Design a protein around this ligand. Sequence first.
Ligand SMILES: Nc1nc2c(ncn2[C@@H]2O[C@H](COP(=O)(O)OP(=O)(O)OP(=O)(O)O)[C@@H](O)[C@H]2O)c(=O)[nH]1
Ligand SMILES: [Mg+2]
Lengths: 163, 142, 415, 585, 9, 570
Amino acid sequence: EMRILMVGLDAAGKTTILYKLKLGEIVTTIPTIGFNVETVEYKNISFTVWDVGGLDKIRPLWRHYFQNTQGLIFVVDSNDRERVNEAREELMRMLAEDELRDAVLLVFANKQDLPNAMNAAEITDKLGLHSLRHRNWYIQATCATSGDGLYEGLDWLSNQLRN
Amino acid sequence: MIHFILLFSRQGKLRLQKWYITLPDKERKKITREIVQIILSRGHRTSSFVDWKELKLVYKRYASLYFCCAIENQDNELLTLEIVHRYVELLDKYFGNVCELDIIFNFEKAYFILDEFIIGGEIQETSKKIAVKAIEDSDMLQ
Amino acid sequence: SASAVYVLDLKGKVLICRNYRGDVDMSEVEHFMPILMEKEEEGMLSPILAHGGVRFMWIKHNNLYLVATSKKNACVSLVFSFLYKVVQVFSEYFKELEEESIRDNFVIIYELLDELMDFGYPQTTDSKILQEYITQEAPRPPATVTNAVSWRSEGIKYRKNEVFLDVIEAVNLLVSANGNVLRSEIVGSIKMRVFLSGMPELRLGLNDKVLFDNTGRGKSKSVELEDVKFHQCVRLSRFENDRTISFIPPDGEFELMSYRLNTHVKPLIWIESVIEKHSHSRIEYMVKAKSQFKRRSTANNVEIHIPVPNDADSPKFKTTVGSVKWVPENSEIVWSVKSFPGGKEYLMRAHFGLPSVEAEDKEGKPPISVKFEIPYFTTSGIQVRYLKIIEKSGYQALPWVRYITQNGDYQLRTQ
Amino acid sequence: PIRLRELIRTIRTARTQAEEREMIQKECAAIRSSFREEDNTYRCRNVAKLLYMHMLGYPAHFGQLECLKLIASQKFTDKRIGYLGAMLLLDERQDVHLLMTNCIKNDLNHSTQFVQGLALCTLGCMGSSEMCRDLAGEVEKLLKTSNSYLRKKAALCAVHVIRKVPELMEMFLPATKNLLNEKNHGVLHTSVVLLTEMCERSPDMLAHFRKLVPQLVRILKNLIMSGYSPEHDVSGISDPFLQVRILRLLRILGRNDDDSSEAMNDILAQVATNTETSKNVGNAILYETVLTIMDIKSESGLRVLAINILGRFLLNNDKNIRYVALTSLLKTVQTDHNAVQRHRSTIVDCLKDLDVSIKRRAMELSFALVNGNNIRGMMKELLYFLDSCEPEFKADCASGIFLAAEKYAPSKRWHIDTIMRVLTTAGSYVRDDAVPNLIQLITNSVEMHAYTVQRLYKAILGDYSQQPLVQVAAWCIGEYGDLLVSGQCEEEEPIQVTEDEVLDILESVLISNMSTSVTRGYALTAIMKLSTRFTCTVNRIKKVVSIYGSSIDVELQQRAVEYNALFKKYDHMRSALLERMPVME
Amino acid sequence: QEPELLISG
Amino acid sequence: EIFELKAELNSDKKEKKKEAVKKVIASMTVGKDVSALFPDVVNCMQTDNLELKKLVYLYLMNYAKSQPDMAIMAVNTFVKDCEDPNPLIRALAVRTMGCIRVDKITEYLCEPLRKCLKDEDPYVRKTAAVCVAKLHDINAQLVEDQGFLDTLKDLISDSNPMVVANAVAALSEIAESHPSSNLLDLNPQSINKLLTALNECTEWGQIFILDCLANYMPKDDREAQSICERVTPRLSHANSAVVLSAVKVLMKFMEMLSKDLDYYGTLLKKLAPPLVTLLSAEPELQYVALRNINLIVQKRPEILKHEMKVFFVKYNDPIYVKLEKLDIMIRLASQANIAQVLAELREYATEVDVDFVRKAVRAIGRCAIKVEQSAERCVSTLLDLIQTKVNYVVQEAIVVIKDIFRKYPNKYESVIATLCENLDSLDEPEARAAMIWIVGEYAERIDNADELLESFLEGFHDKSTQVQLQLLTAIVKLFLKKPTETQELVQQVLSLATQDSDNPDLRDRGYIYWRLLSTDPVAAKEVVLAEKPLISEETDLIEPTLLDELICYIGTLASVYHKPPSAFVE
Ligand SMILES: Nc1nc2c(ncn2[C@@H]2O[C@H](COP(=O)(O)OP(=O)(O)OP(=O)(O)O)[C@@H](O)[C@H]2O)c(=O)[nH]1
Ligand SMILES: [Mg+2]
């Protein structure tokens, strides 16, 4: 019984993560100009996950999915170094809105297959999650190809139901 | 190209509006109100075509409900009358002796009849049986 | 001078028709409606519409249009006073004036419209003496149609002789968005219910400031009325001469007085609303209402109408005293308390939800209007000192008085 | 949530527009509260009730995301109401409509052809320029399918993509290979609409698509000798929309090419003679046939057959057919100019007809049929039509009189007389941008200036309520007062022009509130220009310039302040800067 | 009036 | 339907005769032509029933002008129930026979009018008084021949004051219908007897008597004071038309009273609370009283000079009330209330009623023009209205700020810098020309004037006409204010207004500017930047010869339209 918003930059892992959580295999994903919504069930609650694409014409339109969202998933790309600052400004622009102010934050450090891809702690220092005030956040290192860390992010999201 | 299709009554209130051109809502309501007053400020012997902003407006009365279409200055006005008549015949073949009340209470079904007949301002299905048959299979498709 | 008086509907067809002078062509009523929509389109809607040389002076009731025509320079204040007067005459002749009541009562409406106006000139407009000789169930005309006392008939008797006085105050308030009062006035009304026999001569005694200063007792409590409006029965010349409210009253219910004064006292119910509006997310209302009258008084059925956005949704209400419900028909919330004692301050919290897509047009800001009513209470300080009832037969009648303070145009502007 | 039929009944039980608006807002509140709780079951009926609300003319901006949610669901009825709601609510300028490109692209690869045709219908109806770029390859892969139901909608999607983004037009080239060889007439109709869309859009493929002209001729051939069918048939003739679209495509090709017109000319003669004319459908086919014949370079013997068929369209008693004949004779004016002129008595007979559209196309056909032979002969009837009309037609009538007398003037004196006649009779209906053309033709009339200046002076001396007339007249008086007056330096014999009342009536149009604050500037510049050309009156132009130097009109005040400064300090320099100019073209 | 057949027959 | 009703109406028995007449009245009331049934309902006219007589009278009232040559057959029945002992039927017959507006029967009904102007019953006497005016409007020559005007003048002097009130209304109607020969003017004894009849008549008869007093002119000072002292108690009546007619008499009559005595000041102080409480009425009377108050404060501004907060508009006021209340707030504005007026006008521009918002912005400008000491407060109010970034508010605020700047050009140059970057792609040509005039007039402190004016010239031949003239004037003024960087910018503008321009007034202005700049820039500096004098402001105040006549029409359509009554009659 969670409304989950998947956001993040383009070419990143969001649609692959959504159809790994929903179906369970790797599908060929085009860059989604619109959005994808699938409902998954794991420890018997319905995660209605809203994957919205991350091109430059969809990032003003991210704010139409901020309402009633109980948890944010911000999939980041660890392979590129010049776009993690753009992901930082996108995350700080997104988290400063009055809509989506009680939503918890999940950061997926996706695309970790080759050792130029950075790790979760140093991408936390680049994203500035330690300078977040009154925000419940968590970051773990995932890969969408084998689907490791995704269910641990999902059960952190399920663990953060209890208040 | 048909730019828009309007359906309205003797009281001037709108029954159906489909627009194949992009223009804002204030201009939409203003154009619709002045076009309804232009049609309703005309008699029953007044040649069924008005000129309006280099677009000939083809209209035809059938009951208290009016039917209207707006085409460019390259189309046929009498074939636009036949297009209006084919849409009325498709409403006949779907509902069965259609009145204004079927349009009022099934505006979305009349919208589906217009979408199975005209997309983009142009005719997609010329015939009568194929469009009604496609609506019947989409109705039992659910 | 109205040439013809029409009663219409919302479509504008003629419900009932009456010709007085004939200088306006009678088929010009169908030009009244499209002139009305084309003047409503430009924002140039006026009570006096023109069609060449024919002027349409119209009023609008709850269901009907009452239009008067003229070809010349008509006394338009007389025309509008006549139109509201026959609205009042039809409202006492029937239960309520609607579209339906014209059709079954058309014979008596035709007789009334013949009686009320003759050749553009109003003649007999009192319903109580108008019901004496034209009825829905005809004799000689009474003397009171043409007598000096045109409001009260001779020969009416009562077993118990009683006068009921209702001194009704209506507090009008307009404050700014900053919270400073820019308009605070009291419009009063003495509604009198007269059940008396014969030809009584009534003398109303009030604590007038001008009367008390002219007498020499002007040290006690008195009200300084800025303007006084009186009924037809009141002797205005002797009111001007020695501040005397002397009148032979009409039979039944009538409004004797409507006074007006400005007060520098604090408003009776004070509203402070701070709006925590967030764009595309939510709007929050923090409304505190305090009663600034005395603690022994109690305002009953106060309704604090606070406007909300038209696209708002899912209201959450926190209140201390009363109940607050959403009225989206008026695009507002009202906060209904049943009893508001003086000196008490109550709190209300309201939270809505807003769409992520903005509306195409701007909304506008209506003010906060409250709808209080304080019985056994006057705020100006006017008291009825006496009511001398003088009749040639000689009896002892009982004048009963009560004092109600209610809202008028009690508005508080928002941000 | 209440049903859509109950909401429609509750709307129909209202008595007034205000109470209707209260119950609209009361239903919209519950619909928005159901939207906030994210209810999946009644979102379809809530969006449908909001669509009825938006049809009645009420705000429905809060239902666009729910239309996207209905599109993104798996139920067909939810998809149907969501795609209809997308078509009714979103457009190109709504900017939420970009968020369903992925949803339309997912529905285009659906297993259900009705879901696929729903997405094709929504994309071809209202796809923006941004949606048509990343979905054109998805449209083109449905243009090669064997399903006719998807094929006709993909062809009209290709029409919409080409109409929206015309630089994605070359990528539909191999999708139209052997596309006219299909047998079903809806797919054939949409293919013909697609081919005439690219042929009208670009001329580089006209000879490329002219090799299927005999294929179109053969399709029209078996369409005409298809005698009776119980499908594609209304009023006895078969496939009228397909026949009219095929004849429109055959009008589009062959208008400048000869051999396609020889390949098309025989079936144009066969359609123009062997189809019935007793019905509106056959009249539509004959009108598109005569438009095709008089647009292509056809045979001159059957050009006379087109004359005869337009004649029997003209003396048809039906007003629709008379409108059609007037519109077709307006469509062919530049070709067969000898062959349009014999219907002029019939054209001016329907000029006095009671119908608005009949007299409008009759006026435009008479203006297009004005030439240099008996221009006076149509000109008295055109001024009669100007003087005897309901006054919505006077602006277009005066404008057409202006281009007719500009183009086909035999003499300048007649041109000056007819422009004075239409200026005095039309007056306030004269468009204000024609005043530079009137001043330009008057200044080009070099051999006569005094007569037109005297006629403008006599016209204003009657009345000056007509703003373009006084705007022409003030400029002409201020430029040519030196020959409006002649030899009047002192007092002489009584002549009707005596150099005072011209400045008095210029003062009158300056002082009067029945001026549009441009003709006041024309009159002030006229009075200043008259100071050089008048040698009799002094110290009157100066004081009427001086009292206008404190005006509330800022351009008038600036002009009068500059002219007062020139009068006070630089009075010897005014002839160097207030002289006449050479003409322009 | 509104419950009347749209086609002319 | 017609023949069956004709046969049922041509029957004998009374209740179905009454039902046939009732349904023929009902079929007229639903609005169909039923005038072919005329002699069947006209034949049942002398009845003992009075409801039936009233309905047949109503049919004869609205169906005799359509059939004039055949409605002659009711006159003997009319004169036979003009002599019955029931005065209700007598006055009903007189009232109905005055309403038959055909010409050839009015000579046949002068004898029952002469009988009913004379009888002892005041109901039929006051009906016959109005019937004299009805017959005068039909045939004034026949009424003058029969001599009904002399006995209508005799009905001013009798008792029972509704008879004298109806005779006053009828004689006033005949007096304005006359060609103003042989006037019906009245002595001061008649004035005194009319003022005593004013106290004991009905509330509409008070309006008729006070309308007769609005044509009187008093001959001295104490007579005018006595008539004012007897009229002034009518200001406390609940009828707004009685109040407005008394206001009409008092505003006409204090102009003959001299200002030295103390009655003029008390009349000024006591005329103001009826005018203030006129705004608490119904909205139609509110609109009529607002236009009359607009007429009143132009003549006597000292009446309502301290009562200004009653003219502040409310949200539930109608638009005709609000647009006139803004005019009263303009006409009553001063230094003592201009801060409250500016605070109210700042609120009024935040509304959604568009024409009310532009009227409020123009009212801010009119307040800056009228009150000199509040012009910087108005300018800062308009800058805060500009900063709200609403399109019509901004595009009225540049024109209003420019109209302030033409009046006070001395020390308001500090706001041009924040004025010059305020979304200058606005589409209104009036705001465009105002912003261009501000740029060209104050082109000494604008450092980006050329780089804002160069991007404005791309649609020069297709924008407007006044914008082109102001653009040429502003660019010429900028050039000869600073000729360093503007030499290549004025040359393309002179070529753009001379060579490829088609407009002849713009070509005249461009040729005059080009010839002046080619002849002498030293002379051009003195010509173009000449010292512009103080602007003669236009007057919203009516001229006093029209204003004295418009005070004589208070409560009328002339008072609403602010025009003479001859300017809108047809
Ligand atoms: N090596 C590697 N590549 C991945 C992984 N997840 C996704 N990708 C790549 O990402 C490509 C698709 O782009 P994504 O970034 O996944 O798309 P998105 O996250 O939905 O964002 P949008 O493109 O804006 O819709 C796929 O072709 C994959 O090759 C991963 O875990 N490891
Ligand atoms: Mg992906």
